[PDB]
């Protein structure tokens, strides 16, 4: 009725702070893993050049 309740009450703030920090850490890790994937595709100029060669020009 008296002791354990008081110590739980004393615990509450630190645990709340640590859990908030942990959630912020999770969000930070989520953000840090995001990278934009710029792909490179075969230039169509080569395709045009091949087309010209096939024509025997």
Smaller CB separation from other proteins, 20 or 49 = 49
Tally of CB atoms within 10 A around 40: 5
- Dist. CA 18–CA 12, nearest whole Å: 10
Does residue 45 touch other proteins according to CB under 8 A? yes
Residues with Cβ within 8 Å of 38's Cβ and at least 6 positions away in sequence, in order, are none
Which part of the chain contacts other proteins (CB under 8 A), choosing from 4-12, 25-33, 34-42, 47-55?
47-55
Does residue 24 touch other proteins according to CB under 8 A? no
Which positions lie near other proteins, rule CB under 8 A?
Answer: 43, 45, 48-49, 52
């Amino acid at each position: 009725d008296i002791m354990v309740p008081s110590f739980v009450y004393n615990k509450l703030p630190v645990i709340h702070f640590l859990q908030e920090k942990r959630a912020e850490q999770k969000l930070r890790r989520v953000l840090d893993e995001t990278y934009t994937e710029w792909t490179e595709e075969l230039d169509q100029a080569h395709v045009t050049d091949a087309i010209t060669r096939s024509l025997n020009i």
